């Protein structure tokens, strides 16, 4: 029911098609009618730059273009992150849970999916483990 704004796609395509952003975060608009862009990370922005601003008691969506080395060769995984901390209100968790397939399906090209409910789960450690396979 919640719609996904076109700009969501648009920033996503920048990250994906032109490697313009390291990550894009998405949140429910004030009206709870659409999913909108929260933060755009620049191309050299860090993992900590993303993870540190995640709200302790609210949910978020994100796309992190996760980069790593396999035998010294460069690798990239477009990773889709569902942030849904245990402390977020029921209303919050229900809204993002119901809208996740819609956003994901519009964000063509997702290679890896992570769901995290706390600090260990959204750690770089846990996310790269998933990203490297």
From Swiss-Prot:
Pfam families the record matches: Cofilin_ADF
Family annotation (InterPro entries): ADF-H, ADF-H/Gelsolin-like_dom_sf, ADF/Cofilin
GO terms for MF: actin binding
Transmembrane segments: none
GO CC annotation: actin cytoskeleton; cytoplasm
GO annotation terms (biological process): actin filament depolymerization
SMART domains for the chain: ADF
Keyword annotations of the record: Actin-binding, Cytoplasm
SUPFAM superfamilies recorded: Actin depolymerizing proteins
Residue intervals of the ADF-H domain: 1-132
PROSITE patterns referenced in this protein's UniProt entry, alphabetically: ADF_H (PS51263)
Gene3D superfamilies: Severin (3.40.20.10)
Function: Forms a one to one complex with monomeric actin. Can regulate the pool available for polymerization. Severs actin filaments in a dose-dependent manner.
Homology family: Belongs to the actin-binding proteins ADF family.
Assembly and oligomerization: Monomer.
Name of protein: Actophorin
Organism annotation: Acanthamoeba castellanii
């Amino acid at each position: 029911g919640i719609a996904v704004s076109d700009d969501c796609v648009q920033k996503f395509n920048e990250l994906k098609l032109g490697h313009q952003h390291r990550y894009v975060t998405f949140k429910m608009n004030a009206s709870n009618t659409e999913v909108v862009v929260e933060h755009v990370g620049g191309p050299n922005a860090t993992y900590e730059d993303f993870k540190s601003q995640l709200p302790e008691r609210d949910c978020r969506y994100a796309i992190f273009d996760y980069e790593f080395q396999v035998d010294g060769g460069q690798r990239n995984k477009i990773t889709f992150i569902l942030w849904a901390p245990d402390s977020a209100p029921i209303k919050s968790k229900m809204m993002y849970t119901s809208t996740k397939d819609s956003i994901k399906k519009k964000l063509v090209g997702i290679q890896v999916e992570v769901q995290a409910t706390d600090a260990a789960e959204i750690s770089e450690d846990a996310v790269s483990e998933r990203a490297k396979k």
